Design an enzyme around this catalytic site. Sequence first.
Site, short mmCIF file in Angstrom:
data_model
loop_
_atom_site.label_atom_id
_atom_site.label_comp_id
_atom_site.label_asym_id
_atom_site.label_seq_id
_atom_site.Cartn_x
_atom_site.Cartn_y
_atom_site.Cartn_z
CE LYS A 44 -29.61 18.01 -48.51
NZ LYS A 44 -29.07 17.57 -49.23
CE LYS A 46 -25.75 13.90 -44.97
NZ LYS A 46 -26.59 13.20 -45.52
N1 CTP Z 1 -17.56 6.66 -50.73
C1 CTP Z 1 -18.63 7.63 -51.41
C2 CTP Z 1 -19.22 7.72 -50.93
C3 CTP Z 1 -20.09 9.65 -51.70
N2 CTP Z 1 -19.64 9.26 -52.98
C4 CTP Z 1 -20.86 9.95 -53.70
O1 CTP Z 1 -20.31 10.90 -54.09
C5 CTP Z 1 -21.86 12.07 -54.77
C6 CTP Z 1 -22.23 13.24 -53.28
O2 CTP Z 1 -20.85 13.31 -52.12
P1 CTP Z 1 -21.70 13.80 -50.92
O3 CTP Z 1 -23.19 12.52 -50.62
O4 CTP Z 1 -21.73 14.83 -50.38
O5 CTP Z 1 -20.87 11.87 -49.53
P2 CTP Z 1 -20.95 10.78 -48.90
O6 CTP Z 1 -19.92 10.63 -48.35
O7 CTP Z 1 -22.12 10.41 -49.13
O8 CTP Z 1 -22.05 12.28 -47.94
P3 CTP Z 1 -22.68 11.14 -46.21
O9 CTP Z 1 -21.55 10.34 -45.57
O10 CTP Z 1 -22.83 12.19 -45.43
O11 CTP Z 1 -24.33 11.24 -46.65
C7 CTP Z 1 -22.91 10.88 -54.40
O12 CTP Z 1 -22.80 11.04 -55.73
C8 CTP Z 1 -22.49 9.93 -53.82
O13 CTP Z 1 -22.55 8.45 -53.82
C9 CTP Z 1 -19.47 7.84 -53.71
O14 CTP Z 1 -19.44 8.01 -54.52
N3 CTP Z 1 -18.20 7.28 -52.57
#
Ligand code: CTP
Lengths: 126, 126
Positions: A44, A46
């Site tokens: 990905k 990432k």
């Molecule tokens: N503020 C946030 C951040 C994450 N999640 C939830 O956490 C889950 C998975 O976590 P992750 O994607 O690893 O956290 P992110 O902060 O969204 O990572 P990134 O910013 O790198 O995309 C997802 O269902 C996402 O919606 C959430 O509810 N609220």
Amino acid sequence: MKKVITYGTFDLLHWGHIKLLERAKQLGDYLVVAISTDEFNLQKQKKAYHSYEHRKLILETIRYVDEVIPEKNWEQKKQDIIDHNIDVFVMGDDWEGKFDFLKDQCEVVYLPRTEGISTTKIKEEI
Amino acid sequence: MKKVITYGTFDLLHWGHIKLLERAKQLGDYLVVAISTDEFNLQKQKKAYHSYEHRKLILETIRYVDEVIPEKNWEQKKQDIIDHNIDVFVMGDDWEGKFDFLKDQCEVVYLPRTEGISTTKIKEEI
Ligand SMILES: Nc1ccn([C@@H]2O[C@H](COP(=O)(O)OP(=O)(O)OP(=O)(O)O)[C@@H](O)[C@H]2O)c(=O)n1
Ligand SMILES: Nc1ccn([C@@H]2O[C@H](COP(=O)(O)OP(=O)(O)OP(=O)(O)O)[C@@H](O)[C@H]2O)c(=O)n1
């Protein structure tokens, strides 16, 4: 036993992640979290700060989490639901409608994300 | 009931923090974690990425943690041991010998830190 599953990276564990786990767990009796392996993250493009082994290790200590499995590819979702006898599938609402094809196998729920926090912002602000 | 206490910031929760909490808990029946408030951090000129409220919130979900209290200053240790009826006081061995004066009130244990990981390195590598 009502089993719930959710997918994600959970790299720099924050309160947004906690609130999601909290709400997902309250939808069943047992919560399984499938997290991206390092090979999958590379696919990905990432890269996670913490390794899969450390992300899993930390997730396993959260009260809400019952089991942690590896997420290796995009296609594994339907078989996971079958393999683990999942009753509820939970994802953030930014995925709203993407996994509606699983509704003939279990309940699909999209939870609103927590505002003002994410793993990239943490990295950007550091 | 054998109560244990430990102090720290626990800002960007990592596996080193987890291993400390795991080992501290195994020294008693109940683990209290006193974490630096944001005011104390300002006083120490050591700003945490996550706020006190969010650091506490996340710590309260770790299986090993029974209670989280605020660490507001350097002098509160002796009264905390009294106020919470602490039996075991645990700190990283990087504090080896600094709190030996609490030995007439409870057991003092210095645990070796986990190599290769810390909150500043995470910040430096990001
Ligand atoms: N503020 C946030 C951040 C994450 N999640 C939830 O956490 C889950 C998975 O976590 P992750 O994607 O690893 O956290 P992110 O902060 O969204 O990572 P990134 O910013 O790198 O995309 C997802 O269902 C996402 O919606 C959430 O509810 N609220
Ligand atoms: N690799 C690590 C990091 C921390 N700790 C322990 O965790 C407790 C408090 O955590 P904290 O100091 O907040 O973590 P650090 O990574 O040391 O943060 P920093 O680099 O800013 O000092 C201390 O007793 C410390 O010994 C540990 O055992 N092993």
